[PDB]
């Protein structure tokens, strides 16, 4: 499958991502590492992701989330949930069972499959920040740990977030690596130490 672009592009609206500082306590369900530009999260737990812009994009703007494998040998393979998780009864009535990335806390998600590449993505309308806020938050959930294919260790993934207009045209792009794991706080500390 043709590999989607992962090139960061702030664009005309200075679009980029942000993440709350969550620390590395073993109780943390989701934590982001700036040095690794990597999100560590527990299976099916909500992950707040921040959207920042220098100016509000036009009406009808949309935000798409798509996962792609990080290893070159895996890049052309569509990221899907493991057969077991897909068969698991955890559906919310909105997301097809095969989708790895889901949105929580948004009334308007659209779960899509590209007719050519077969890649999945989930899109929600872009909304400006709430009063007193400089960013907008979208809550994502990763519904599979890829345990059936060697886990995140063998099958690391990246999430590509794109700001788009109502017709699907690119307005901005950013991305981050994601590791679904048992103890996010522990994994981050270990990987950051290893990085050093």
DSSP string, 36-88: TTEEEE-TT-EEEEEEE-SSPPPTT-EEEEEEEESSTTTTTSPP---HHHHHS
Q: In sequence order, what are the beta bridge partners of 112?
A: 121
What is the edge-to-edge ordering of all strands in the sheet holding 46-52?
A: 16-18, 46-52, 136-142, 101-104
Structural domains in the chain, CATH included, are 1-196 (2.60.40.720)
Q: How was it solved?
A: X-ray
Helical residues (DSSP H) of 70-142, grouped into ranges = 83-87
Residues 53, 168, 3, 74, CA torsion sign = positive
Report yes or no: 184 and 177 within 8 Å, Cβ to Cβ.
no
Report yes or no: 138 and 64 within 8 Å, Cβ to Cβ.
no
Q: How does DSSP classify residue 35?
A: T
Q: How does DSSP classify residue 95?
A: S
- Binding site members for Zn(2+): 82, 85, 144, 148
Q: How does DSSP classify residue 159?
A: E
* Exposed / middle / buried, residue 43 (Cβ in 10 Å: 0-12, 13-18, 19+): middle
């Amino acid at each position: 499958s043709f590999v989607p672009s992962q090139k960061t592009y702030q664009g005309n609206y200075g679009f980029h991502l942000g993440f709350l500082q969550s620390g590395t306590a073993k109780s943390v369900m989701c934590t982001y590492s700036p040095p690794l530009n990597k999100l560590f999260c527990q299976l099916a737990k909500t992950c707040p992701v921040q959207l920042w812009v220098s100016a509000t994009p036009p009406a009808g703007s949309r935000v798409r989330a798509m996962a792609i494998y990080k290893k070159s040998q895996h890049m052309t393979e569509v990221v899907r949930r493991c057969p077991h998780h897909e068969r698991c009864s955890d559906g919310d009535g909105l997301a097809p069972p095969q989708h790895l990335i889901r949105v929580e806390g948004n009334l308007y998600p659209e779960y899509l499959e590209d007719r050519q590449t077969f890649r999945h993505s989930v899109v929600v309308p872009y909304e400006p920040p709430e009063a007193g806020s400089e960013y907008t938050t979208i809550h994502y959930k990763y519904m599979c740990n890829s345990s059936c294919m060697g886990g995140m260790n063998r099958r690391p993934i990246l999430t590509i977030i794109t700001l788009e207009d109502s017709s699907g045209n690119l307005l901005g792009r950013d991305s981050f690596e994601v590791r679904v794991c048992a103890c996010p706080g522990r994994d981050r500390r270990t990987e950051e130490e290893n990085f050093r």
